[PDB]
């Protein structure tokens, strides 16, 4: 039973950054040489665990997280950084025995008229603990005039939608990001 990482990375569509999903890779063998030799990958900065011995090492379990974010904000997923995409939408701890993978995806995720399906949270009263998810969409308030649920002055919708269009693509091009974290999985099993 080969691990389904090659079937989850090589997929059709993913969820937004604020509604990121997780998958539990069960007991299976996993060869990451296919991850290393893949030319389509763009950013593969792997923190913590040594890169080459990644297949050699064995851990209790591995978790796979993924989402879609702007190209210019792929840097902020790295540990020990702050911003509008890492402080609120998806926070990552100071040190984690895993690493992230990012590769460009424009044709499969952007349309000439623009895409409205992807959303990202803009307003929140406080930051998030590491590996914390929040889906609830409550009308965020300035705090002086209570909002009963009517949009207007001092009451805004917390969620906002990215706009992806064929453009310069330096930072506005949509980038797909997948996060692997290590906690019964061994690769070689010689």
């Amino acid at each position, epitope marked *: 039973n080969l691990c389904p990482f090659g079937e989850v990375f090589n997929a059709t569509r993913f969820a937004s950054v604020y509604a990121w999903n997780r998958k539990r890779i069960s007991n299976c063998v996993a060869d990451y040489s296919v991850l290393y030799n893949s030319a389509s990958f763009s950013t593969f900065k792997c923190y913590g665990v040594s890169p080459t011995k990644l297949n050699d090492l064995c851990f209790t379990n591995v978790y796979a997280d993924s989402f879609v974010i702007r190209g*210019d*904000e792929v840097r902020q997923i790295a540990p020990g950084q*702050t*911003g*509008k*995409i890492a*402080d609120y939408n998806y926070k990552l701890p100071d040190d984690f025995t895993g690493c992230v993978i990012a590769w460009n995806s424009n044709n499969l995720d952007s349309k000439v008229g*623009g895409n409205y399906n992807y959303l990202y949270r*803009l*307003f*929140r*009263k*406080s*930051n998030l603990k590491p590996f914390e998810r929040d889906i609830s969409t409550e009308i*965020y*308030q*300035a*705090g*002086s*005039t209570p909002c009963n649920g009517v949009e207007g002055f*001092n009451c*805004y*919708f917390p969620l*906002q939608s990215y*706009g992806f*269009q064929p*453009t*310069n693509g*330096v930072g*506005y091009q949509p980038y797909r990001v997948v996060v692997l974290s290590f906690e019964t999985v061994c690769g070689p099993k010689k």
Partner: single-chain antibody, 222 residues
């Protein structure tokens, strides 16, 4: 009615220190954003700082470490700590509330004067006209964006700027129908159907595409 107040005027020798304050009524400082924009004499507006809810903060690389920004929920004010100065820091400081995409810098302060001891450009320049004729403005961007990150500002002499257009032709409440905007691709245009006697002012373009950075154009006068 939301209104800001500032008390920072003074004269300081190089190497001195002076602090700034901004009282806010009608909106909590902790929840809403904050931003200090600096305008050198005879120069365009320049960005200094931004405060998101929580301890996150970012500065302008031009002035890093010499400026410290902090908030205070007790007095509903934010301070701009300033331990080190130089000769080129002489300017006027404006503090305003930010809303990112859903509006940009809706309400501004009154401006305080202090004295010591991607790029955007706007073409037309003077564009002098009598009240009868119609006026159109042009400012372009070196790198294209989805046009949802643009804003237009007007600044009457001796006062503080106010919002006119945000988010790609979406006007503000109370703004007359005279002002309108339309921009696509690299060239972005604002048109004014009729010129009232009071409409004579100075207009600026804005871009908030970058998350921590906002770049202000040189601006056009009328």
């Amino acid at each position: 009615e939301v209104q800001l107040l500032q008390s920072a005027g003074g004269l300081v020798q190089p190497g001195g220190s002076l602090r700034l304050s901004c009282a806010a009524s009608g909106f909590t400082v902790s929840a809403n954003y904050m931003s200090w924009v600096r305008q050198a004499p005879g120069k365009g507006l320049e960005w200094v700082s931004v405060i998101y809810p929580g301890g996150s903060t970012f500065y302008a690389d031009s002035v890093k470490g010499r400026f410290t920004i902090s908030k205070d929920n007790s007095k509903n004010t934010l301070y701009l700590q300033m331990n080190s100065l130089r000769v080129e820091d002489t300017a006027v400081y404006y503090c305003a509330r930010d809303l990112s995409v859903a509006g940009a810098f809706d309400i501004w302060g009154q401006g305080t004067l202090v004295t010591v001891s991607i790029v955007l450009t706007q073409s037309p320049g003077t564009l002098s006209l009598s009240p009868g004729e119609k006026a159109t403005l042009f400012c372009r961007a070196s790198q294209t964006f989805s046009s949802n990150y643009l804003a237009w500002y007007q600044q009457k002499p001796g006062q503080a700027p106010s919002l006119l257009i945000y988010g790609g032709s979406t006007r503000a409440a109370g703004i007359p129908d005279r002002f309108s905007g339309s921009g696509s691709g690299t060239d972005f245009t604002l048109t004014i159907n009729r010129l009232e006697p009071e409409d004579f002012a100075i207009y600026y373009c804005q871009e908030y595409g970058s998350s921590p950075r906002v770049t202000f154009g040189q601006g056009t006068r009328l």
